[PDB]
Amino acid sequence: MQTLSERLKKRRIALKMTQTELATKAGVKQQSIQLIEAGVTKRPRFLFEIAMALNCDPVWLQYGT
Template sequence: MESISQRLKRKREEMNLSQSQLAELVGMTQQSLQAIEAGLTKRPRYIFELSSALHCDPHWLLYGENQNSDLIGHGA
């Protein structure tokens, strides 16, 4: 089962973003993003900003659920 750190890193890499690029988009430090990807932070406070920047559902990013609704704002 994937963790938040694995899902975050996979989505970031799919979008061809570096840690520093994503951190800047979200308004957090690269070190904070690195801590999430390293598994040191389990419930980041920037979860909604991260999911918005990565075009994915925040619930999926946190828990790995609702994977089919991965684009925010593109539903009915």
């Protein structure tokens, strides 16, 4: 859970959401989530919005603190 992709996947799943629901609520492409969760995108463009949908601190999501 020390990687961003790991952190987002774990939190998404803790909130009982699908990648699709995450995507809808954050207003980004579902292909954007997969890439983040699959560890491709290290620096997400809409991290803020993603974090808002996951009810967590963006800083925490990006850096793990």
